[PDB]
Amino acid sequence: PIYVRFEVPEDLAEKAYEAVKRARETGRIKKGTNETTKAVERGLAKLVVIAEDVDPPEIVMHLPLLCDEKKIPYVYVPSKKRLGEAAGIEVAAASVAIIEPGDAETLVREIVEKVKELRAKAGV
């Protein structure tokens, strides 16, 4: 999946799901590619979470490069279904932007630091 630019360890993906849930429950998130893209463009996203199994994939393919342009970190999770569950909706979500982490503050910081590690190693 060409828009999936680097591998993510399974336990970090779990942290990402849990960060989305906690931010949704106690903070503010955006759901879906249109509001995720706007939050990134506007510099409001603290962390973007992108599902690896979106089909058709075109709706998410621009997000990683846009995040990079805006210096906003992103991470991947395998399952749009699980990402939607975390985002508090009844169906799959392609992407989420965490705006206000709330009680997800620690997880978000942990995820950002760990993705920095992954990307330094991968060189992407």
Swiss-Prot record:
One of its GO terms (cellular component) is ribonucleoprotein complex. One of its GO terms (biological process) is ribosome biogenesis. SUPFAM superfamilies: L30e-like. The keyword Ubl conjugation does not apply. Coiled coil: none annotated. It is found in: Cytoplasm. InterPro entries: eL8/uL1-like, Ribosomal_eL30-like_sf, Ribosomal_eL8-like_CS, Ribosomal_eL8/eL30/eS12/Gad45, Ribosomal_eL8/Nhp2, Ribosomal_eL8_arc. Keywords: Cytoplasm, Ribonucleoprotein, Ribosomal protein, RNA-binding, rRNA-binding, tRNA processing. One of its GO terms (molecular function) is structural constituent of ribosome. Belongs to the eukaryotic ribosomal protein eL8 family. PANTHER family: RIBOSOMAL PROTEIN L7AE FAMILY MEMBER. Multifunctional RNA-binding protein that recognizes the K-turn motif in ribosomal RNA, the RNA component of RNase P, box H/ACA, box C/D and box C'/D' sRNAs. Part of the 50S ribosomal subunit. Probably part of the RNase P complex. This is Large ribosomal subunit protein eL8. It comes from Aeropyrum pernix (strain ATCC 700893 / DSM 11879 / JCM 9820 / NBRC 100138 / K1). The gene is rpl7ae.
